[PDB]
Amino acid sequence: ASGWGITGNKGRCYDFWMDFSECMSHCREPKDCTLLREDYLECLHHSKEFQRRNRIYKEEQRKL
Amino acid sequence: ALKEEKYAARRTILPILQAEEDERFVSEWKKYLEYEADVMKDVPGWKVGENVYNSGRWMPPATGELRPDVW
Amino acid sequence: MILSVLSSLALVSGLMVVRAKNPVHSVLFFILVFCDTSGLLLLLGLDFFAMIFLVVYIGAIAVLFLFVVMMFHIQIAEIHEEVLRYLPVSGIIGLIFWWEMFFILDNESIPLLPTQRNTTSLRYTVYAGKVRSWTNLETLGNLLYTYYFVWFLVSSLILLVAMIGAIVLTMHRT
Amino acid sequence: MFNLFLAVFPEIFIINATFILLIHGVVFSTSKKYDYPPLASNVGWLGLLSVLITLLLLAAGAPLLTIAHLFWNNLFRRDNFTYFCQIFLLLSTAGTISMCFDFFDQERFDAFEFIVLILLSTCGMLFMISAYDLIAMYLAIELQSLCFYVIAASKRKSEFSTEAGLKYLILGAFSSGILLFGCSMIYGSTGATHFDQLAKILTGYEITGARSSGIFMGILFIAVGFLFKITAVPFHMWA
Amino acid sequence: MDLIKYFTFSMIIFILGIWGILLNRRNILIMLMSIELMLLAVNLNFLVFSVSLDDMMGQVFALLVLTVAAAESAIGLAIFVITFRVRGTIAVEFINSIQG
Amino acid sequence: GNPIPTSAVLTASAKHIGMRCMPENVAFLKCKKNDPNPEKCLDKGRDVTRCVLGLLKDLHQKCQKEMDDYVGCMYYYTNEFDLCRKEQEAFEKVCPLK
Amino acid sequence: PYGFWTFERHNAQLRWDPQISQVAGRRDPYDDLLE
Amino acid sequence: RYLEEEDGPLMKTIKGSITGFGAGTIYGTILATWKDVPRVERNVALPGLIRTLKMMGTHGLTFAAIGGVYIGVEQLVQNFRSKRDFYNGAIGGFVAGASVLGYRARSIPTAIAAGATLAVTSALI
Amino acid sequence: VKVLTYFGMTLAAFAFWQSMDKVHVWIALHQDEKQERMEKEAEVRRVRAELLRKA
Amino acid sequence: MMLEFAPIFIYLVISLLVSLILLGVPFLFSRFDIRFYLVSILFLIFDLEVTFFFPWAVSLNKIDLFGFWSMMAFLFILTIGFLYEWKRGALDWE
Amino acid sequence: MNTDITALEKAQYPVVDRNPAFTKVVGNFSTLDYLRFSTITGISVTVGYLSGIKPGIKGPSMVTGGLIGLMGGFMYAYQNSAGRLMGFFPNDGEVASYQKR
Ligand SMILES: CCCCCCCCCCCCCCCCCC(=O)OC[C@H](COP(=O)([O-])OCC(O)COP(=O)([O-])OC[C@@H](COC(=O)CCCCCCCCCCCCCCCCC)OC(=O)CCCCCCCCCCCCCCCCC)OC(=O)CCCCCCCCCCCCCCCCC
Ligand SMILES: CCCCCCCCCCCCCCCCCC(=O)OC[C@H](COP(=O)([O-])OCC(O)COP(=O)([O-])OC[C@@H](COC(=O)CCCCCCCCCCCCCCCCC)OC(=O)CCCCCCCCCCCCCCCCC)OC(=O)CCCCCCCCCCCCCCCCC
Ligand SMILES: C[C@@H]1CC[C@@]2(OC1)O[C@H]1C[C@H]3[C@@H]4CC=C5C[C@@H](OCCC(CO[C@H]6O[C@H](CO)[C@@H](O[C@H]7O[C@H](CO)[C@@H](O)[C@H](O)[C@H]7O)[C@H](O)[C@H]6O)CO[C@H]6O[C@H](CO)[C@@H](O[C@H]7O[C@H](CO)[C@@H](O)[C@H](O)[C@H]7O)[C@H](O)[C@H]6O)CC[C@]5(C)[C@H]4CC[C@]3(C)[C@H]1[C@@H]2C
Numbered sequence A: 001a002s003g004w005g006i007t008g009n010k011g012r013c014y015d016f017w018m019d020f021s022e023c024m025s026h027c028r029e030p031k032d033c034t035l036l037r038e039d040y041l042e043c044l045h046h047s048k049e050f051q052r053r054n055r056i057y058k059e060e061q062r063k064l
Numbered sequence B: 001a002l003k004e005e006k007y008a009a010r011r012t013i014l015p016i017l018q019a020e021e022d023e024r025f026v027s028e029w030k031k032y033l034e035y036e037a038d039v040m041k042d043v044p045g046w047k048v049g050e051n052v053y054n055s056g057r058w059m060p061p062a063t064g065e066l067r068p069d070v071w
Numbered sequence C: 001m002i003l004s005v006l007s008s009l010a011l012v013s014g015l016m017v018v019r020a021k022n023p024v025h026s027v028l029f030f031i032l033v034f035c036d037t038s039g040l041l042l043l044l045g046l047d048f049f050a051m052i053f054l055v056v057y058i059g060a061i062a063v064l065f066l067f068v069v070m071m072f073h074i075q076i077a078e079i080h081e082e083v084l085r086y087l088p089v090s091g092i093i094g095l096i097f098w099w100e101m102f103f104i105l106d107n108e109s110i111p112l113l114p115t116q117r118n119t120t121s122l123r124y125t126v127y128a129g130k131v132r133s134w135t136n137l138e139t140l141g142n143l144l145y146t147y148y149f150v151w152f153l154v155s156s157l158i159l160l161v162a163m164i165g166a167i168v169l170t171m172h173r174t
Numbered sequence D: 001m002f003n004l005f006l007a008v009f010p011e012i013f014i015i016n017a018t019f020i021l022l023i024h025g026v027v028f029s030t031s032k033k034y035d036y037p038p039l040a041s042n043v044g045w046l047g048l049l050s051v052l053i054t055l056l057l058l059a060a061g062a063p064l065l066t067i068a069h070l071f072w073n074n075l076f077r078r079d080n081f082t083y084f085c086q087i088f089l090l091l092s093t094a095g096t097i098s099m100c101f102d103f104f105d106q107e108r109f110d111a112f113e114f115i116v117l118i119l120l121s122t123c124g125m126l127f128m129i130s131a132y133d134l135i136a137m138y139l140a141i142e143l144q145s146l147c148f149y150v151i152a153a154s155k156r157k158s159e160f161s162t163e164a165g166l167k168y169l170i171l172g173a174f175s176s177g178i179l180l181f182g183c184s185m186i187y188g189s190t191g192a193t194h195f196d197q198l199a200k201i202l203t204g205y206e207i208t209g210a211r212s213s214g215i216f217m218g219i220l221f222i223a224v225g226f227l228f229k230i231t232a233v234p235f236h237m238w239a
Numbered sequence E: 001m002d003l004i005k006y007f008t009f010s011m012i013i014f015i016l017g018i019w020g021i022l023l024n025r026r027n028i029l030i031m032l033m034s035i036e037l038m039l040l041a042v043n044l045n046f047l048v049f050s051v052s053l054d055d056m057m058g059q060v061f062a063l064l065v066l067t068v069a070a071a072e073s074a075i076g077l078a079i080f081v082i083t084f085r086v087r088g089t090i091a092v093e094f095i096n097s098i099q100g
Numbered sequence F: 001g002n003p004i005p006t007s008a009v010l011t012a013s014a015k016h017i018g019m020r021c022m023p024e025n026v027a028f029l030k031c032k033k034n035d036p037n038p039e040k041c042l043d044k045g046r047d048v049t050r051c052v053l054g055l056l057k058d059l060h061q062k063c064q065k066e067m068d069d070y071v072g073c074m075y076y077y078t079n080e081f082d083l084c085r086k087e088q089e090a091f092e093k094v095c096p097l098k
Numbered sequence G: 001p002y003g004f005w006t007f008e009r010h011n012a013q014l015r016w017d018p019q020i021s022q023v024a025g026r027r028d029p030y031d032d033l034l035e
Numbered sequence H: 001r002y003l004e005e006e007d008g009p010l011m012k013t014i015k016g017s018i019t020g021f022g023a024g025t026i027y028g029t030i031l032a033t034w035k036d037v038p039r040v041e042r043n044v045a046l047p048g049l050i051r052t053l054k055m056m057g058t059h060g061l062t063f064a065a066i067g068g069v070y071i072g073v074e075q076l077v078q079n080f081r082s083k084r085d086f087y088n089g090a091i092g093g094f095v096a097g098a099s100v101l102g103y104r105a106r107s108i109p110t111a112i113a114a115g116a117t118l119a120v121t122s123a124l125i
Numbered sequence I: 001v002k003v004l005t006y007f008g009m010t011l012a013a014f015a016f017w018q019s020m021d022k023v024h025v026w027i028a029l030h031q032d033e034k035q036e037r038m039e040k041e042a043e044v045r046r047v048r049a050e051l052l053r054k055a
Numbered sequence J: 001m002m003l004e005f006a007p008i009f010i011y012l013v014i015s016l017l018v019s020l021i022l023l024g025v026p027f028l029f030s031r032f033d034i035r036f037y038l039v040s041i042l043f044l045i046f047d048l049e050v051t052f053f054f055p056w057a058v059s060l061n062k063i064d065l066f067g068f069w070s071m072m073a074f075l076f077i078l079t080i081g082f083l084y085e086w087k088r089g090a091l092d093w094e
Numbered sequence K: 001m002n003t004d005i006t007a008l009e010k011a012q013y014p015v016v017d018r019n020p021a022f023t024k025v026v027g028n029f030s031t032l033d034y035l036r037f038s039t040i041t042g043i044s045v046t047v048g049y050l051s052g053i054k055p056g057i058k059g060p061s062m063v064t065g066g067l068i069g070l071m072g073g074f075m076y077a078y079q080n081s082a083g084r085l086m087g088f089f090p091n092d093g094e095v096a097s098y099q100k101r
């Protein structure tokens, strides 16, 4: 969230953070900002990306 | 001033290096998409190269190595 | 694999910290743990922190511990005890902590299984950030003294408290 | 630029006064000419004065404490709540100091450093009240805690006082480590330490099935540290 | 797998500190050493997260936590020294007079 | 024929490239600023590449020997300008920046 | 309250961060190439 | 508010005996670690471990007995009588407390106290 | 300890960490089944909530 | 880049081997002084001072006047502590 | 260093100068500011003298108390004057002087 990157440029996930914060700054229900929030958290941890790639690896191991 | 000379030199040749890298990555990504289409053939509900980000904005593929750039 | 080696060294050295009968030996093993930690930090690309862990943890803190423990001349009878009767209580507490706390990141940070395919070609290089790279040192120094200077100064206050307390509690002027 | 620091006038004053008293005490306590006078009561009166002036500066400058809030935002947050909390803290410190003079002169506790450590811990608690980030909160808590460790052991030839200090330092350090672990888990799970960012991330989800075990255990460890601090059972037996 | 491996390293250090508290009932110096081990593990947690998240906040706080660890060890060892000086021994049976 | 566009060749020619391919460079950088997706920038990249390779071939045609010496020294010293001043001056005297 | 995080006191970063958006250490790398 | 189960009174009693042996083993472990070792056992390791394990087993046994008899009598009361209330379970709490804790305490006074206590708890449930 | 004792403890620890690696691979491979179980239980809970709200 | 640290590791291994060879070839043919604790404490404090000096020294060109004066305030606090130690006799070994 | 004087709670009185310079604030000191300043300093000197008698350092104690009082009183007067110029405190005199010069 801070924006200070470890190599002296804008942090990797800072634009996602700022989109989420700007959404929540005027949407009275946080459920309206769910998509931007999960985009921010996906940028931090890559959970869904790695899960999908592991599904691909799983199917490869099944068909071999 | 010496450092600025080197740094300006890096700035003028940046676009051609980036364009080469972009072409390389696009070709590799097409090959990987064909690979995924083959492997996930006969897996119902799949979508080849689906963007996991809702915003759809482009991000480089995550690598699963904490600090690959320093080694 | 390399992280397996360093983690194994850290595990054994830490067990030696907590289980060596002689406290001087405990301080020396503690120093081995900090060396291994510095190795991990070098793997992360944080060379400033890797060096500072040597300078401060080993060069200053461990030296303080060693000076104090060596002049104490502790006899083993004063601190000896059998630990065989703790194996169960350490087993539950360790297991519960093990089952919960080694795997806490697994649901949030799912690992990428390494496949029989060269994913290295999918690494995208942005040369723009490489024209003028910043060291760990200068990235940290860009922030400590301007945008977060209050925390810096509060840390100075903490050190001042340490100095005053050290004098008031132990000083016997000749 | 100077006017930005109106938000921290109370703290600047008390810190500077504490430094002045430290120098005064050490210069004249070591004086052969004055025959090494005890300065605990003299420094105590001057420090009571300093606390009261700090209270005046803070109470009379209620709006000014919120000046330049964007510039100070990543360091602390001053509002109505922190205003009254800090006033009550200063009033309590002044009363506690006023109760100490008979102890200073009749026991002959001559250490003026006692007053300085009390004042520095008051500085720490002032910064605790206005903390709006896990890092700032931890630093202020640690400053406060280290001052208490030292003053708990002030009767350094007493078995009781040395025992108190030893138990306090060990159990305090343990609890602080637990709290810091919780803070690290929360940062790792959310990428944030500022209280506003944490509020935005955590609101609307609590435990929506897909709960961040990292966030849940960071909260738990931080709560354990807090409960130790308020002497709540089962983290009480130090008290 | 990098991030899980870096985290379990720091985690074993933290668990070792906990075990050192549990196994050292007659040795309070090692108890202090175990507390430092826990503090080191937390510091490592901040540095790893800083890299993983590409964020500098973990690094600033790590430096400040090192300052706190230093002050903590200094004051703790002073208190150890004065306790030893009063009693002539570090055995736990001579620091149990406050009770009830 | 066409020189291999290695790091040495590009670094040695960087001043000429900046003076000659400035519009293509700026256009590419603007498009990259708007969109980091490599696929959505290939055209500006082709414009940049064509400009640079044309200038490279031109400079090779004009001053072959001086270019060869400057490129060789630049490769020998890993593109350190200070250790290559003499041949830089010889290269710029025969192939002016303009 | 309903949407407390909407209250201006809680949107401090949304107003501060744009003021430091050109500060070295948090810029997009392409800003230096075009400026 | 309670429709997440599959029940089975025999399964209830068996699982209660297992949870009670779970909880008694942990409780005995904690009790054994809290206490000091006898002075004549400071230089020898094995008997301390043996005593800790014996305390673990004894407390697991007694807590399993309470945790089994409680649910067993509770279900054996709401099956023959065929009613659901806090009265069924208060009888079970009383019999479990009385029987087990008076066998261990070897005192009729204490059994009636333990049974009374265990009922008020199940009743407050 | 003996130097050889320290080396052997290090070897045992290395084996432990490789086993931990296998455990992490196992946990990763079962993400999909855990998600499926979570989804089925969520559907059951939602159906129960909707049905009980009907009254 | 961390590439340059690898020669250091190989250098350490070789230096260790030289040490073992040199040391192993001949096998073929209760008075606690508080002042040491005090000097350790002082070294710890000024060790952290140097630690905090390093990033500041490399960052002076970017932090400008604000960073300079913030470090000056840090040093002022630590130097007040040093004056306290000096007056109390912590720096006298007689 | 980017700066922003903007306060959370807006000024309730006319803003004569949003971010007044140090010397302007000092030159804005009124008679009441000087009264506050002098009172705080005098009380501090008195406390220094009285608390210094028993140790035997009443003079140096007066000096120390006076330094504390001088710094505190100046900070308080500056607080009041700057708050008046910024519109956070009642500032009839500042508004009157502003509408004329
Ligand atoms: C094919 C190649 C062949 C050629 C090469 C062969 C090379 C030789 C073999 C390598 C060396 C092995 C032999 C070691 C020396 C033995 C000779 C000797 O004289 O020893 C005297 C020794 C006397 O002790 P001492 O050194 O004189 O010190 C006396 C005082 O203690 C000194 O006082 P102190 O203050 O310094 O220390 C205090 C305290 C220090 O307290 C302690 O150190 C604690 C002792 C218990 C250690 C508990 C485990 C620690 C290791 C970590 C393992 C993972 C832990 C994970 C826990 C966290 C998870 C939540 O002292 C002690 O308690 C000493 C106890 C030593 C016992 C060590 C037992 C280690 C556990 C082995 C478990 C084996 C399981 C295998 C699978 C493991 C699961 C993966 O007695 C012994 O014989 C014990 C050592 C023999 C067993 C240890 C070595 C095990 C290695 C197994 C082989 C590796 C298998 C895995 C391979 C993986 C391949 C992929
Ligand atoms: C590509 C890589 C190629 C590598 C090739 C090399 C591979 C070597 C494999 C060796 C394993 C097989 C050994 C076969 C048997 C050998 C025959 C034999 O044992 O006779 C030897 C014989 C003693 O053997 P022993 O019969 O077993 O007696 C043991 C005790 O007496 C028993 O008495 P105790 O029961 O009362 O125990 C008291 C305690 C004494 O109390 C202690 O605390 C022990 C000292 C530990 C801490 C001391 C260092 C911290 C103090 C500060 C030092 C300065 C710090 C800064 C400078 C260094 C930092 C770079 O003794 C011990 O616990 C000894 C345990 C040793 C643990 C420490 C060594 C491991 C360090 C990590 C090595 C990493 C690489 C190897 C692993 C690679 C992955 C598997 O005499 C000698 O060892 C000669 C003395 C010269 C030793 C020099 C070693 C280096 C010292 C300077 C460096 C200090 C830092 C260490 C490196 C740090 C790296 C960053
Ligand atoms: C002053 C006093 C004295 C004492 C002291 O200070 C104090 O003295 C100080 C001196 C210190 C030592 C100094 C130096 C080191 C070396 C370091 O060790 C480097 C290890 C790193 C670098 O290793 C490679 O790095 C590059 C590859 O990465 C290589 O580049 C190639 O590859 C490029 C790309 O194609 C090409 O472009 C290039 O052209 C091509 O050359 C490069 O050559 C090579 O070096 C990290 O590497 C690993 O990391 C990987 C990621 O985790 C792991 O990947 C694995 O996991 C993945 C999934 O996660 C899977 O996908 C993978 O399949 C699967 O393999 C894998 O384990 C392994 O690669 C370990 C620490 C240590 C010992 C320090 C210890 C502490 C001290 C003794 C201090 C001590 C305290």
Ligand SMILES: CCCCCCCCCCCCCCCCCC(=O)O[C@@H](COC(=O)CCCCCCCCCCCCCCC)COP(=O)(O)OC[C@H](O)CO
Residues within 6 Å of the ligand: C146, C150, C153, C154, C157, D001, D005, D008, D011, D012, D015, J062, J063, J064, J065, J066, J067, J069, J070, J072, J073, J075, J076, J079, K001
């Ligand atoms: C051993 C040496 C001891 C030295 C002791 C003397 C100096 C101690 C520090 C005193 C504070 C500053 C005194 C110097 C006055 C000159 C200040 C000045 O010149 O103004 C500059 C601004 O100076 C400052 O504002 C820095 C003030 C330093 C902070 C001192 C702390 C005061 C209170 C802080 C409150 C926080 C709570 C304290 C926690 C313990 C102008 O800079 P700029 O606005 O043009 O641009 C900023 C910069 O160039 C780019 O980054």
